[PDB]
Structure 1
Amino acid sequence: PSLEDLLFYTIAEGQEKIPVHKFITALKSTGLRTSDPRLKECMDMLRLTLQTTSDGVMLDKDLFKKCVQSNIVLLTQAFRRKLVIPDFMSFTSHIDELYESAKKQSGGKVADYIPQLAKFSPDLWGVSVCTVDGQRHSTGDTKVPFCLQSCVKPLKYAIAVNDLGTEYVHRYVGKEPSGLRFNKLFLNEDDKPHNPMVNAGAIVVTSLIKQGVNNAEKFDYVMQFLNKMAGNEYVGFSNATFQSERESGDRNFAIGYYLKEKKCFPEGTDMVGILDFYFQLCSIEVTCESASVMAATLANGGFCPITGERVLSPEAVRNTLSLMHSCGMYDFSGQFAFHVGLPAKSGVAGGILLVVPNVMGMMCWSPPLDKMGNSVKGIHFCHDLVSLCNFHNYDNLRHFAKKLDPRREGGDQRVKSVINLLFAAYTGDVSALRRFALSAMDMEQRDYDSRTALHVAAAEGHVEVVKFLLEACKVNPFPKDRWNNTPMDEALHFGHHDVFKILQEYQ
């Protein structure tokens, strides 16, 4: 048992008792939401002990201790800002802005090759987020469910590997893409398809899940995994879009038969059944909120964010995520993996599975597709993102451009590096001063006491630093500070004639 009283005094912030009207009010300001299966005991014991009082609103310290005990491991992270995204409210206030910009794209034709997908109205703006720590935010028509379509093909693969291993699985599918051209073909020279991300590959994958049973046992074996990955949230089914997909189930028929001749399915397997199973799976429906938990399930290395289960073997997660990078969202995949860099997979319903490994998993949804087969608002959001954030899979963490990295604090990181411009003026160090001037830094940013590099540099009595500040950087030679002591006034306050030799001439 820790000193959970620390948390207490962290919230009480003065008076004796904690009004639970506030504990939760701040718990969600960290992003985390009440409905976390990890904060169940911290809410069940909360209700259970909060009705043993004159009025169920206040708290004694000992009763709070009675509440958390088992859910403190996480609350620690929540309020200590160990959450993989510390500042969440302003960051989500940015995500809402990008939702506003991307939603406005009045384009794209609705996937109307069957009625179910044509019913979805064009003006639907699903945006749901889930970080690998459980914190979540969402905006738009996120509560609306929709058939997943091709978006299910990644998970398929993963599941297979998670039970079968990479070796056995890739004995029937390829590991590489094919490109804009060589796109018509079903198979590769090795007489097997290119990757799980293409229809033929997805079919071959489906032929491996649970060998020796029927399409009702396999179906539940799948819905089990999807429920685990989504925090047991919405894992639904649409028989309507299933019959629509099987009646208009066009080429996939031919793909199935051709595969049937070339031993593209394991020994003793029927094509007609596996095909129908493929349709069933492609007809599964979820909402943005529920898919976000799955994207995050992959971002967290297989382990679910809002529960903590060994859902998928990290092996399968790695394979899946790489194949989503390269062979991801249709012929666009390439230009995506280059221009946006994130592993993803689009579905013809309008939703895009989007993973940012070890950060978050997301879900955007706009049925209006683009001539490429991908979403309109979806992609506009995808690249209106990395243009403002350093999430590009091969960007730089240390010296990114003018982007934003919310992995470090929001307010504190603005002083973690403005101080690092100034302490290169206390020992007489210009190496760091030229390393920070060559890093494109605004050389007049003040510190806590409102003193730029010239005030401290002139206070120490260092000539070279001022030689780098007043001439090489064009820093103000007539500045003030919080004590109202100009560079000459501090050169006089502490007794430096060699710096006063500089300050007298630059008037």
Structure 2
Amino acid sequence: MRHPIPDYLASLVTELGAVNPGETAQYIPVLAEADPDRFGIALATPTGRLHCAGDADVEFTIQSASKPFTYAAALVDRGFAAVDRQVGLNPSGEAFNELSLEAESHRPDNAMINAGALAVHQLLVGPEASRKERLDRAVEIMSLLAGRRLSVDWETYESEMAVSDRNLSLAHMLRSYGVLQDSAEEIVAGYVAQCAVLVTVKDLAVMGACLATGGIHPMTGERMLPSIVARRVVSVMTSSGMYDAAGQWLADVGIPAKSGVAGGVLGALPGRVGIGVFSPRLDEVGNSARGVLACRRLSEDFRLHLMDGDSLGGTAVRFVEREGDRVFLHLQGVIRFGGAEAVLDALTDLRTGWDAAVYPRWQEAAADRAALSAATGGGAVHEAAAAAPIRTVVLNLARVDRIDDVGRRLIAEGVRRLQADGVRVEVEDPERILP
């Protein structure tokens, strides 16, 4: 049997590919003359899959879709305080207003606009890094998240460098307020080469997936970025990535994204998917017309949204069974606050230690313990109450994939209170992830 996702994409490409509105970026001949009859799409999942269709293997310069990655690199190389001193978090469009530097926050609005992107490149490796070290760094971060060594399209680079007065203007203004210590030319050149890095629809998807998983590469399971960094990046993409798109992106689509004038759209939906779309022609706001439309279709057809409550929750509890005096509590999944909270509810429900009159309905619902949990997604937490003198509780973490420090602290505290009740607790933790 073939996977149905790739078929949906193939169908989507055929449907939306029936037309080709807008026009390629006209600012440089290499892009203006680019073949418009191309349309590809790729989805990278945490399950390590890559569902594609169309020209998802055709290279094109990433352009502004590079901004979220050099931003992550800067945060990693310098720390939040250093980066935040130069780049703000204020949602904004590209139009430059000197008041953002002279007043307000006294720094370029955010990393998604050119002024912020320029300050990010200036920040890359370190305070006194050379231009080559910084470009290498920009190329490296993107290559590491893509899973392969990427190259810069020097032809595109040279063409753009001939028509960069606006970017040079921004860089000079930044210098005058101290945001850039190096020359306008040096930083613009780095930013332009950064934008000229060649990637495929598939590359973007995987790179986006790395952000969507909270910093974990979906193909290797290796942590590429601190979750705190990946979260900041996707947060900024949400607020400003599609600032000038029709309607209101977060509300309408709910998929953090960023387009590039060469036709590539990057998407990163936390906990679910990395997205890459390629279609040369741009709409009037400057985003890939079909790339944008494809994202709106993915969001609608698959009911994907930053706001949908798809969490582990009570499923963190695989089951709770009792054998006379001892109870077996097996956990599973990616446990964080939500999962750990559910685990504590189960422990507390063992009885090893609102007003019902006010909410009669809440009591009746709570009566059918299993039904309420099903309509709520409480996993097997309700089994704990069913199990409930208990003298021993075996805590099995074999099925738990991973857990963050918050989850560890909460469960650890849960274990302490169980013992404080006079209950023996043995933790079966084969890959010892609890400590």
- Residues 139 and 197 of structure 2 are in contact (CA less than 8 Å); yes or no, is this contact kept in structure 1? no
Q: Helix, strand or coil: the match of 2:131?
A: coil
| Matching residue within 151, 166, 169 for 2:65 | 151
Task: Tell me which residue corresponds to 2:356.
Answer: none
Task: Tell me which residue corresponds to 1:115.
Answer: 29
Task: Tell me which residue corresponds to 2:153.
Answer: 238
- Residues 341 and 392 of structure 1 are in contact (CA less than 8 Å); yes or no, is this contact kept in structure 2? yes
- Residues 326 and 334 of structure 1 are in contact (CA less than 8 Å); yes or no, is this contact kept in structure 2? no
Q: Helix, strand or coil: the match of 2:242?
A: coil
Letter in 1 for 2:159: S
- Residues 327 and 333 of structure 1 are in contact (CA less than 8 Å); yes or no, is this contact kept in structure 2? no
Query: CA offset at residue 381 of structure 1?
Result: 1.0
Task: Tell me which residue corresponds to 1:395.
Answer: 308
Unaligned runs of 5+ in 2: 312-364, 376-435
Rate the CA distance shift 1:132–1:207 in 2: closer, same or farther, 3 A. same
| Matching residue within 350, 353, 364 for 2:263 | 350
- Residues 93 and 113 of structure 2 are in contact (CA less than 8 Å); yes or no, is this contact kept in structure 1? no
* Higher share of residues assigned strand: 2
User: Within 5 A, what are the aligned runs for 1:83-94?
Assistant: 89-94=3-8
- Residues 390 and 396 of structure 1 are in contact (CA less than 8 Å); yes or no, is this contact kept in structure 2? no
The question of 1:259 aligning with 2:186 is answered no
Letter in 2 for 1:394: M
The question of 1:220 aligning with 2:220 is answered no
CA offsets, 1:26-75, max 9 Å, x none? 8xx6xxxxxxxxxxxxxxxxxxxxxxxxxxxxxxxxxxxxxxxxxxxxxx
- Residues 241 and 283 of structure 1 are in contact (CA less than 8 Å); yes or no, is this contact kept in structure 2? yes
- Residues 92 and 110 of structure 2 are in contact (CA less than 8 Å); yes or no, is this contact kept in structure 1? no
Rate the CA distance shift 1:282–1:96 in 2: closer, same or farther, 3 A. same
Distance 1:151 1:178 in 2: 16
Letter in 1 for 2:291: G
| Matching residue within 16, 21, 33 for 1:102 | 16
CA offsets, 1:199-226, max 9 Å, x none? 0000011111123232222222232222
- Residues 174 and 193 of structure 1 are in contact (CA less than 8 Å); yes or no, is this contact kept in structure 2? yes
| Matching residue within 145, 164, 180 for 1:249 | 164
Query: CA offset at residue 187 of structure 1?
Result: 5.3
Of the two, which has the highest radius of gyration? 1
Task: Tell me which residue corresponds to 1:423.
Answer: none
Letter in 1 for 2:234: L
Distance 1:155 1:221 in 2: 10
Structure 2 length-normalised TM: 0.67
Distance 2:233 2:297 in 1: 25
| Matching residue within 97, 111, 117 for 1:185 | 97
Rate the CA distance shift 1:106–1:272 in 2: closer, same or farther, 3 A. closer
| Matching residue within 322, 329, 336 for 2:235 | 322
Letter in 2 for 1:122: P
CA offsets, 1:314-349, max 9 Å, x none? 111100001101111241287112210111111111
Distance 2:200 2:170 in 1: 30
Rate the CA distance shift 1:107–1:186 in 2: closer, same or farther, 3 A. farther
Query: CA offset at residue 193 of structure 1?
Result: 0.8
Unaligned runs of 5+ in 1: 1-25, 30-88, 399-428, 440-507
Task: Kindly report the root-mean-square deviation, in angstroms, between the aligned alpha carbons of the 2 structures.
Answer: 2.4
Distance 2:230 2:116 in 1: 17
Query: CA offset at residue 248 of structure 1?
Result: 0.5
Letter in 1 for 2:108: P
User: Within 5 A, what are the aligned runs for 1:466-485?
Assistant: none
Query: CA offset at residue 382 of structure 1?
Result: 1.1
Letter in 1 for 2:141: F
Task: Tell me which residue corresponds to 2:49.
Answer: 135
Structure 1 length-normalised TM: 0.58
Letter in 2 for 1:185: N
User: Within 5 A, what are the aligned runs for 1:66-465?
Assistant: 89-178=3-92, 183-186=95-98, 188=100, 189-211=104-126, 212-232=128-148, 235-265=150-180, 268-332=181-245, 335-397=248-310
Q: Helix, strand or coil: the match of 1:363?
A: strand
Distance 2:167 2:290 in 1: 28
- Residues 44 and 273 of structure 2 are in contact (CA less than 8 Å); yes or no, is this contact kept in structure 1? yes
Query: CA offset at residue 164 of structure 1?
Result: 1.8
- Residues 231 and 307 of structure 1 are in contact (CA less than 8 Å); yes or no, is this contact kept in structure 2? no
Q: Tell me which stretches of 4 or more aligned residues in structure 1 moved more than 4 Å.
A: none
- Residues 327 and 334 of structure 1 are in contact (CA less than 8 Å); yes or no, is this contact kept in structure 2? no
